[PDB]
Amino acid sequence: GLSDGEWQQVLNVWGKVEADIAGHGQEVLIRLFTGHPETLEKFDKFKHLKTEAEMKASEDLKKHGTVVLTALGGILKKKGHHEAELKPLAQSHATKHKIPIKYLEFISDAIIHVLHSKHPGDFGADAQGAMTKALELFRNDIAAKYKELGFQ
Numbered sequence: 001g002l003s004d005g006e007w008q009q010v011l012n013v014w015g016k017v018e019a020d021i022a023g024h025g026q027e028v029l030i031r032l033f034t035g036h037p038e039t040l041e042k043f044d045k046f047k048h049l050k051t052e053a054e055m056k057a058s059e060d061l062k063k064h065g066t067v068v069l070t071a072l073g074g075i076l077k078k079k080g081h082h083e084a085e086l087k088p089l090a091q092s093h094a095t096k097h098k099i100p101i102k103y104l105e106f107i108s109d110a111i112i113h114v115l116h117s118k119h120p121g122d123f124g125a126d127a128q129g130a131m132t133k134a135l136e137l138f139r140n141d142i143a144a145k146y147k148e149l150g151f152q
């Protein structure tokens with residue numbers, strides 16, 4: 001549950017992402033894959049990537065980063081009223097992709113890391129607080145759908 005002022009912070013931060021969605025999306029996925037190599041194994045189309053240089057050179061990885069952040073941005077712009085947008089993603093990630101909630105924690109922290117890396121000194125403590133709460137809400141509502149489905 002976020003206040004209006006917290007949502008305003010989230011959507012202000014998101015403007016930084018929308019200025020370069022593919023570059024942010026690329027770095028988020030690279031941070032996930034390099035920090036948690038078991039996550040790469042869930043992607044049949046990226047498992048061939050052995051080095052970070054290959055990851056950086058991959059145009060399909062940048063494309064998928066755009067898909068991921070476009071979906072997340074659409075959810076964030078709903079300011080918590082995201083049941084219709086979140087349900088299909090929860091269902092596909094639990095039932096088709098088999099993504100444990102832990103990996104959603106990993107990608108949430110990766111987003112925070114990338115924001116500080118690309119905007120050092122320009123991602124203030126209030127902005128980090130609000131973005132973290134928004135990603136916690138996203139993860140928590142996914143977790144509720146995972147429990148419904150019995151998925152671990």
Ligand code: HEM
Nearest residue numbers: 039042043045067068071072088089092097099103104107
């Ligand atoms: C911010 C969190 C994330 C969002 C918004 C997101 C969004 C998406 C979207 C929009 C798709 C394509 C449509 C679909 O299949 O439902 C997708 C596919 C997928 N996602 Fe995610 N995802 C997230 C996190 C993750 C994580 C952490 C993993 C694994 C570690 C993952 C694994 C996958 C896989 C394996 C696919 C299919 C890729 C392919 O072969 O085309 N997702 N995701």
